[PDB]
Amino acid sequence: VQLQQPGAELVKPGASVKLSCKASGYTFTSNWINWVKQRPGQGLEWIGNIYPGSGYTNYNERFKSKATLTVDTSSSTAYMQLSSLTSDDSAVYYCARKHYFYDGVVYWGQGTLVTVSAAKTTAPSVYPLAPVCSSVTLGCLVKGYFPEPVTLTWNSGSLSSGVHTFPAVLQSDLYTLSSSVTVTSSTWPSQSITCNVAHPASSTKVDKKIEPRGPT
């Protein structure tokens, strides 16, 4: 909406990556753009900020040389280059800015998950899980992908109240995630239920319709 960031970046150790943060509206040159780091399951850490109109920067000493902030005022986009990457640089990176007039409003991008690794991108295999041959529970297994994340929905967002999508688990250097959806017994198979999975890192999108199991 207000700040657009890519979902992921896969980068090799020792290399560098340039993260983008595109801002909507007209006042890009008049508001500070801030950058924040968050390692998986950990806290928040402020990296620094930049005033787009002038290019003036304030860096947290801990990120000097590791991070370089710049802007392209012609496309209202802020950039953060991270250099000589190590595993400790794997984390979610957010951009954020205050509202032009009101102090009680702060806009945040969705965050970009940077994964530092020598491994290649691998698209997931998606499996529909129907019940064993009131209510009914169905599942969807998203297996063997790299890196995170994937975005999973049910009936393109039309089913959400009875859904549980679990944190992914890493094994043999590939991730696997599962999701369950529970609905009334008269809902399925009478009506169609489909698992939708997106994995932007490999530019893939797959839909798998859940079908009752047969003698196969």
Binding site: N58, Y94, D103, G104, L129, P131, G139, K143, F166, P167
Partner: protein, 214 residues
């Protein structure tokens, strides 16, 4: 830098009651102009942080009146009155007095509710997976309370401990329960050499199937 300390990693609260979350700074945040530069944010799992309070006591836009803030120059408190299930998440303080800006370590709000046994469902491998040479059996233990739970797998009557991977969700924002998914993965050949598969949850609830029973 100014060090921000949140001494409690988490705090419990019964829905409908009030809770106070604390934070302290290593230097006073009260400026010569009369304002105190302390902020509070809430972060829900899988979402970006949301501003709750600015300059110690001012309520941010779109935040309900149940939230309020107070403090001295070095000790602050975020108060949440009549707590709702949707309030679950991690609360962070931040100072905006001097560069570099710094955050406290965060305090997780945990809601109390009545004990609930899990709703258990087991799933044989999809036949599409079996083609890959692998076979995963999945068991969901959903909407239970409290958070601690145990899962045991048995193949043809015997307990199986290797090849199991578990994953847990954060607390549900509507009903304050927890859920867990347990996956047992075997080779296709091993899966075919056995027939009875069982998932046992002890919070014992058992769900099972026979491979060839279709």
């Amino acid at each position: 830098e100014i060090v921000m300390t949140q001494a409690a990693p988490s705090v419990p609260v019964t829905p409908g009651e009030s809770v106070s979350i604390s934070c302290r700074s290593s230097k006073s945040l009260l400026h010569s102009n009369g304002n105190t530069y302390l902020y509070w944010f809430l972060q829900r799992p899988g979402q970006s942080p949301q501003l709750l309070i600015y300059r110690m006591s001012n309520l941010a836009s779109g935040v309900p009146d149940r939230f309020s803030g107070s403090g001295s120059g070095t000790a602050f408190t975020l108060r949440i009155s009549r707590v709702e299930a949707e309030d679950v998440g991690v609360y962070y303080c931040l100072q905006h007095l001097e560069y570099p800006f710094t955050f406290g370590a965060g305090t997780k709000l945990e809601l109390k509710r009545a004990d609930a046994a899990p709703t258990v469902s087991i799933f044989p491998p999809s036949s599409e997976q079996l083609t890959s040479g692998g076979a995963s059996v999945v068991c969901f233990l959903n909407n239970f309370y409290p958070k601690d739970i145990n899962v045991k797998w048995k193949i043809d009557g015997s307990e199986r401990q290797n090849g199991v991977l578990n994953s847990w969700t954060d607390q549900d924002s509507k009903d304050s329960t927890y859920s867990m998914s347990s996956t047992l993965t075997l080779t296709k050949d091993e899966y075919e050499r056995h027939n009875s598969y069982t998932c046992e949850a002890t919070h014992p609830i058992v769900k099972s199937f026979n491979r060839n029973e279709c």
